[PDB]
Task: inverse folding
C-alpha cells in the first residue's frame, strides 16, 4: 500500500467509515502513529510471547515473510581508531552497522576457520571465566558489548592463537518511517525520525494491514483519553 | 586418526546425536578425558584381570599389537655419581630411564655372560637370604628397588666375582598426552602432563577407537555426576 493508501484507509477505519464522526487526525499525527505502530508490530512479532500466536521470527512461514525485507547482512569494522579499554585481554573491538535493530546471526572468519558467535550473557561470562581453560569451544566464539559511543561496539573474544579476518552480522534493519505527506509544507520543522519528506513502508505488504490496524487502535486509544486505555494498549509497545 | 578426528568424533559420539543435547565440552576437557582414557586403557590391557577377556600384555595378537608402539628398550645408568646406603652390601645401584611406565623384561651382561633379572619380592628376599648360598641361579640375577628420587633406582645382585657391563631394560614407555589444540592462553597456560602444545596419540591406531569410547564414557559419567557413576567407573582406573 502506497502512503496515500495508508492515509485514505486510516479514515475508513479511524474516522467512523470516513464520516468525520470521530475526532480527525492531521497527516503528521497519522504519520507519527503509523511509525509507532510499525515499531510496535516489529517488536511484537519478533518476540514469540509478544504476539497472540506464541511464534517468533522463524517460527512459521508468515513470520519468515514478515521480516523478509528487514533482514540485512553487513560486516563489522575494526574499531582500531579509538584506543579504548576492553574488559577481556584478547578482545578485538568491532563496530556494528548504524542501521541495526536486532541481531540474529553473527559469524567470524579466523585463520583456523569460521566460528559461530555466541552472544554470551554477563552471568555465563563469569561462570566460564572461573574455570581452568577459559576459551570457547572449537567451533564458536564469544561476544560481549563494550563502551559504545553513538554506535554499537562489540568485543569479539575468540580463542587465543587465532586472528580475526572477518566479521559478518545478519540483523534486522531499522525500519524507515511511514510519512503520508511532505511535513515541511504545513508543519514547520517536524520530523518523524529525521526525515521531513514522503517515506514509504520498507516492509513486505503482508504486514501493512497489521500496521494500519495497530495505528487505528493507537489513535482511538490516544483520543479516548482514558488512562486505562492508554496503559492497556501500552502493554503491546514492547 | 589425528587430534582433529578425535575431537570431531568425540563431539559426534557425545552430544551431536543425543536427543536433549548437553553442552559441548571444551577442548581442555576433551584432552583431559582422552589422556585419562589413554592411561586407563593401558592399565586395563596390561593386567588380564583388568579387562573382560582375561588377557594381559602378550596373551593374544591384539594385545601384542596394542603395546607394540609403546615398547621401548633402554639401559640403566650406574649410580656411582653420589654415595648411598644400599640395603645389600653386594648390590650395585642402577638408575632406570625417566619415562618408564612398566618393566616387562630386564637383562644384565656380565663377564660370565648374559643373565636374566628376576624381580624378587620382599618375602622372597627374606626367604632367599635365609639359605646358605644367598646368590641367584646360574643364568639369572636378582633385583630389588632401592631409595628412588625423581626416578627409579634399582639394586642388582649377581653371583660373586662378577662385574656388570651393561643393564638393558625392556619397559613400556610412558604414554604421551592427547591434546587437541594449543592450550596456550593469555589468561594462563594449562597443561595435561606439562606440555601445552598439540600432542598426537603415540599408540597404535588399533586402540584409538577404544580410547575414544572410554573418553566418551568418562565424559557422560562426569555429566551424571552422582557418587554411583564415579564409584562404578572408577573401578576401571586400576
Result:
Amino acid at each position: 500500500m502506497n502512503v496515500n493508501e495508508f492515509s485514505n484507509e486510516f479514515d475508513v477505519l479511524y474516522n467512523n467509515i470516513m464520516s468525520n464522526a470521530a475526532p480527525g487526525l492531521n497527516e503528521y499525527e497519522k504519520s507519527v502513529l503509523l511509525t509507532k505502530a510499525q515499531e510496535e508490530i516489529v517488536k511484537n512479532y519478533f518476540e514469540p510471547a509478544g504476539n497472540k500466536y506464541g511464534k517468533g521470527l522463524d517460527d512459521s512461514p508468515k513470520r519468515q515473510i514478515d521480516f523478509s525485507e528487514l533482514i540485512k547482512v553487513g560486516e563489522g569494522v575494526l574499531n582500531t581508531s579509538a584506543p579504548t579499554i576492553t574488559f577481556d585481554k584478547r578482545a578485538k573491538v568491532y563496530d556494528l552497522p548504524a542501521d541495526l535493530f536486532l541481531v540474529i546471526n553473527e559469524a567470524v572468519d579466523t585463520n583456523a576457520g569460521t566460528k559461530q558467535i555466541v552472544p554470551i550473557s554477563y552471568s555465563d561470562y563469569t561462570r566460564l571465566m572461573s574455570r581452568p581453560y577459559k576459551e570457547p569451544v572449537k567451533y564458536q566464539a564469544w561476544r560481549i558489548i563494550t563502551t559504545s559511543i553513538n554506535n554499537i561496539s562489540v568485543e569479539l573474544i575468540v580463542n587465543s592463537n587465532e586472528t580475526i579476518t572477518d566479521y559478518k552480522v545478519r540483523y534486522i534493519r531499522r525500519p524507515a518511517p511511514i510519512i503520508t505527506t511532505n511535513l515541511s509544507s504545513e508543519y514547520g520543522d517536524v520530523t518523524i525520525n529525521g526525515v521531513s519528506t514522503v517515506s514509504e513502508c520498507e516492509l513486505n505488504p503482508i504486514i501493512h494491514s497489521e500496521i494500519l490496524q495497530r495505528a487505528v487502535e493507537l489513535a482511538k486509544a490516544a483520543y479516548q483519553g482514558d488512562l486505562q486505555a492508554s496503559v492497556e494498549l501500552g502493554q503491546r509497545s514492547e
